Design a protein around this ligand. Sequence first.
Ligand SMILES: [Ca+2]
Ligand SMILES: [Ca+2]
Ligand SMILES: [Mg+2]
Ligand SMILES: [Mg+2]
Ligand SMILES: [Zn+2]
Ligand SMILES: [Zn+2]
Length: 270
Amino acid sequence: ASRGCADDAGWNDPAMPLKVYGNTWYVGTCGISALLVTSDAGHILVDAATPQAGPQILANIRALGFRPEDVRAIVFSHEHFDHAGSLAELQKATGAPVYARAPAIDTLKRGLPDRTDPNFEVAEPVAPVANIVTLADDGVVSVGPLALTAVASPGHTPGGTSWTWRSCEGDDCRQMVYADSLTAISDDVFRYSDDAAHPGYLAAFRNTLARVAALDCDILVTPHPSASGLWNRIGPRAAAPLMDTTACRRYAQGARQRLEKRLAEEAATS
Ligand SMILES: [Ca+2]
Ligand SMILES: [Ca+2]
Ligand SMILES: [Mg+2]
Ligand SMILES: [Mg+2]
Ligand SMILES: [Zn+2]
Ligand SMILES: [Zn+2]
């Protein structure tokens, strides 16, 4: 029997791919999520993990019996190197457009962020993405019968987005939420409390927390699987229910607490 994945797993430690629910499959690593949402009209790939993960994700797609060439759209959570790292690599393999909100586009074209990213100084360089479709802040990405709805989620980054869709097993349908990271982390320079340096940025983060908390949410998945306890819900170590309609609300409330701790830390330092 396989032992499964650790919560502190390396971002590049391989995971055996497995069904999340219905036509939503996990194709990421033990430390970093990626999902494949499938149909007989083609598929949608959600996230790209770490600049080193293009081959694992592609291998995992094929392990499940799906073809990367049948992916017709790529979406992602946010424009940090540990989630957007293998986008260009995946675009070549699939031929699919990458959808991105306006505040992430320059980062995707450069392969590095600018000072609008809290984590600017710790960014690792990515391959640029050549074919980007600009995504409205409440846009829907459609591939045949599939429809993924964007929920703009700025705060952890300017361009972050959460995604929601329905997956079914027979007549039993679930609202899936791939909620963006909500951690108030940064490089050693950025201050969330310095509004003059980035007017409205922290207010937008608070608004994201409220919006995520309110989402209809049967099954939550997050870019770092441990942020939603994913390996306690699927795979060999599963001991808690996959479905929990309180998960989004609890995820956002914890994030709000941690955001306010970060503000306290900033108040304590010059
Ligand atoms: Ca329902
Ligand atoms: Ca996360
Ligand atoms: Mg693998
Ligand atoms: Mg949580
Ligand atoms: Zn991040
Ligand atoms: Zn991350």
